[PDB]
Design a protein around this ligand. Sequence first.
Ligand SMILES: *[C@@H]1O[C@H](CO)[C@@H](O)[C@H](O)[C@H]1NC(C)=O
Ligand SMILES: *[C@@H]1O[C@H](CO)[C@@H](O)[C@H](O)[C@H]1NC(C)=O
Lengths: 245, 85, 434, 65
Amino acid sequence: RTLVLYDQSTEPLEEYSVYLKDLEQRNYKLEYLDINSTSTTVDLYDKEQRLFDNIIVFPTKGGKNLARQIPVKQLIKFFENEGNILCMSSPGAVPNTIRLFLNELGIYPSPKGHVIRDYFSPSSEELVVSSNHLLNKYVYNARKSEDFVFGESSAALLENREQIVPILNAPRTSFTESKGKCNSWTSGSQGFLVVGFQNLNNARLVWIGSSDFLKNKNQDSNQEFAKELLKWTFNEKSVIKSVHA
Amino acid sequence: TYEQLYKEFHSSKSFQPFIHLDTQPKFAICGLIVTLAVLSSALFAVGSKSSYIKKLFFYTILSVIGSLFAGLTTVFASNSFGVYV
Amino acid sequence: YEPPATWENVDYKRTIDVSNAYISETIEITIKNIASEPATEYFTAFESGIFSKVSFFSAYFTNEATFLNSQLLAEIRYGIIQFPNAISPQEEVSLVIKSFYNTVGIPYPEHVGMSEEQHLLWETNRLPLSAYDTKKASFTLIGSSSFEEYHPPNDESLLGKANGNSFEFGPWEDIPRFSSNETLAIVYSHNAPLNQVVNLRRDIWLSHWASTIQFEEYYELTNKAAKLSKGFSRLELMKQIQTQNMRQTHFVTVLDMLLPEGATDHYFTDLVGLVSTSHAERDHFFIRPRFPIFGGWNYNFTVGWTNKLSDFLHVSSGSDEKFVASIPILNGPPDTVYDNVELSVFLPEGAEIFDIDSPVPFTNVSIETQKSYFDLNKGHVKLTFSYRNLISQVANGQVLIKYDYPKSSFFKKPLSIACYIFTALMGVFVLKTL
Amino acid sequence: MITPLDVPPLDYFDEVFTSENWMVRIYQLKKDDAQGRTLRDVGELTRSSTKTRRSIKRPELGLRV
Ligand SMILES: *[C@@H]1O[C@H](CO)[C@@H](O)[C@H](O)[C@H]1NC(C)=O
Ligand SMILES: *[C@@H]1O[C@H](CO)[C@@H](O)[C@H](O)[C@H]1NC(C)=O
């Protein structure tokens, strides 16, 4: 089932085991795959036959490797055929193929240089997002207030259509400031940090705007949120069907 | 038993038609002429003023013949036109 | 249910020919009897899926041309073979079985352009599925240019050996009974149009007055080949036929009906009227549909003709009023497959059936009456058979009807019209004299 | 006279039949896009694939409702 892309150079997989093990304990059969070591490409379709049902794209640093492995015109055709997708990004990791694919969906992530920052924060060292910013009850509804840890996040702009499902928000004060003299990508609460998307065929994509959200070093603050977002992404939390009309 | 029916099939003679289909239009026209050359006399008899019993008799006696001839022309003509029997 | 183990296959070589749009299996087996009371039986094993669609099952000795009483039964299922003479307790006899299935491989890519070649995928069992212990077994595929496997097994022994015109398999020295744990799947090239007649109903109108027998058939034809991607485009079609590329394309452009010896008054009709692209040469009726039948397209049409009656009836010997008719059961395109056949024979107004025999086991037989032109009482006598699975050129038989038609009812046909005309005249008389 | 550069492409319909003499032509409506894009964008993405590249441009769009 699930496929797991990663890049040892950018982010080692050893810091994401806790969640993938949690997937292996729920009957998922996931095949690990490297980005550069394997010169041979992976085959999502063979003669109009979808092989895998899920994809997890851990952070990468662009390059021609990813672009060879899964081009846009193939990833769109895979996602359209009821193939769920998880996708991560960060100002240190912005794959061009991912950016173009998301732009084709309707989500616009930030570019490489731009990074979000918030001066009104309890912890100056990294980003702490309050649990009051949850925007969609079906994905995750906070039973009790908590603080999700993010680090060097990158907010995204959203178009105005009926499929996009905002899941988290950025604090109103926060703003993206790039190194160069480029205009701020997103100002205020208009910038979203975690964004879902549901196809018309009930396929589901989830974009997480930080590489530090799913790391195993942060499992005391945002454990339940991640374990519910990974359930929603793989079509096993909120699925509805009508039996007799 | 398929074997014995298949044995009886080949042994027997073939089918000889009663009146060949090539000479049926001739009988069709030669009966169409007669079946109206007679059925006009029927209408003349019924129209003519005479005894009722004699009218009935000379109507039915030459109406039965016209009936038979028409009922035997309407088969030859139907076969000749391409709609068999 | 398992049959009492009584025989041992001392040789088992099977060949499958996939060259003519239906799987034709031919197994040659030498068989030995277990030392016991002489038994006269044999149970060939068909899988429950394949057995649902099988249209011909014969079995004969190699030495003797004559066949045996091969019969199907009524979750592995079985077919019964029975020998004329009881086999000795310890004897060795060769035998050959021929089966004709009705399933062809599905198109593998399923979306091909109208100029590309299509490949088909078929799923069978590698190791022989028999009800007895087999000693030696070999498997062979023929009838295609190129073969390939699909998810091949790691074990080298279970791997096909390619040949120039065939795809063989290595002989296995010892195989246990009821072994069906390996589902082989193989792809092969095939460029035929893969016709399939979803419903055929053919009427045969006997007639003694005109002495002609006329056939009328109503085909519902579906192409099963790989559908075409990007949709239809007349530009590509009319640009490829102007080059020499109409060799063995997988869409139907012209059908070739094979009629009886001397036919006349051919016609080819369609639901929306008359089709003018037909051509009747000697003993051959070429038909061009309105549109070329690509993969997945349906065409329903009608075709009819007329024959002399002297070739199909025979008057009996003892009496001159007992007739025997031998109606052909199928004559259509060269290699099709029929999923339903409804054969109706319309004997004349006053016939009365005495015997009915068919060379292929039918599903249902019934007798009714249906009125036609100038049928003023009880019409014609319709006798309808319903067959289920039939092949085009190997299910060649002749239905034998035996009836009687007395002259006391041969001449009632003009009298039944004379009665109406006489009644009309005697009514006009009363209406005019009153 | 008609030149092949005249007729623009058809993005919302797709031809499904046309007679031998091109007399009657039957087209079919395309099913709406699954991702919600306008079919003209799909068309411009499939006909202009390699050369239509822009480095970085902040999209101008109304605030998410
Ligand atoms: C290629 O992948 C290996 C995997 O261990 C990694 O160590 C290495 O840094 C990578 N090189 C790159 C991305 O240039
Ligand atoms: C066979 O045909 C007769 C005639 O209509 C029908 O009554 C009967 O139900 C049929 N039986 C089967 C098994 O098809």
